[model samples]
Target: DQNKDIQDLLDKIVFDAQHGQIWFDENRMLLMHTSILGFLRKDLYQMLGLERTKRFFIRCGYQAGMRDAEVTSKLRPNNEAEAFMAGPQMHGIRGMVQVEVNELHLSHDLKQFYADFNWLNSFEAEVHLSEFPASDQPACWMLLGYACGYSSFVMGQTIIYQETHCVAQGDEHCRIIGKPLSEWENADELI
Candidate 1:
């Protein structure tokens, strides 16, 4: 579940309380916990219902990934794979979830992209389980958005991610699949 390069990336963060900032290699970041998220999530999920809650979280996550892609692209301009790998590496260091890429393919010309990953013990799933009952549907909405956002920015296309398995739905582990949006049938529902 862990990546080998994660420790090196973690060193780039500058946590300066006096300056009121936590910078990940000069990209500002916020350290957050599920306790705070739980409160906000409950208020939104229960009130907004599943449909709206999923959209809000997915949109929010996609924005977050775009920001990461912007900075990471600058960092690894010469390498196609490294720049893409940096997204998952940064996400892992942030403790969002452990991403192990089980299958990966990327075209240097940005014409094609595909990846399948196993995500372990996602924070969102843990929080969702704690606050509410196990869901009939996959529950890693924000994570799905994050993967889609991160991949789309790097791949230069509308990449969509969907979870095939999730702890919030009583799965043993979480697995997400991502590819160009056109590859998915009925992908409209995922977005």
Candidate 2:
């Protein structure tokens, strides 16, 4: 049980003294607190301001999500479904957010793709609220960015994700939907 902190992931971590590194399988990763990002966010906001900082976080997440998608595919080479599953599971393992998938549909040809996810204990939203007052808009920028990049990489095309519901806006949880950019109204503004 991952939530219970048992066999779900403890065995996957490796501490290598020879190379002076820590790794998850062949993938090197770090375990750190979101407060570090919180500090960065404040600094970025002062320099670039709010919107650009949010975009910066989105771009950051997009890059990471794309990278993670590659790792997920490599880890589950045989099954597309398992590969998709890994995208979400990767979030939990990487100490980002807890992803509870609401629904997912993926065409084998990588043409049709749509998915919904509920985010519990999102680090971005929690930290943002911690530093500032509750936002009037959705605040999970990085997670939304990650969803787009991860799903786009899997689908072989550009996919966009938006926060449909947000904890930062006082919702019980954060929810998101992903589909091709054309499917969304005013999609140009999203980028």
- In the predicted model 1, the residue pairs found to clash are none
Residue runs of model 1 more than 4 Å from their true location after superposition: 1-4, 189-191
TM-score (C-alpha) between model 1 and the true structure = 0.90
Q: Roughly what TM-score does model 2 have, to 2 decimal places?
A: 0.86
Ten-residue segment with the worst summed lDDT in candidate 2? 1-10
TM-scores for every candidate against the unseen true structure? 0.90, 0.86
Kindly list the per-residue Cα lDDT of model 2 for residues 1-191, writing each as its tens digit. 33543233446668887787887656787767888888887889899988998999999899888887776665555526546766677777777888887888776475787788899989998888878788888989998888888888877788888898888899999999888878888778544
lDDT of each: 0.81, 0.79
lDDT of 2: 0.79
- The positional error of residue 31 in candidate 2, measured at the CA in angstroms, is 1.6
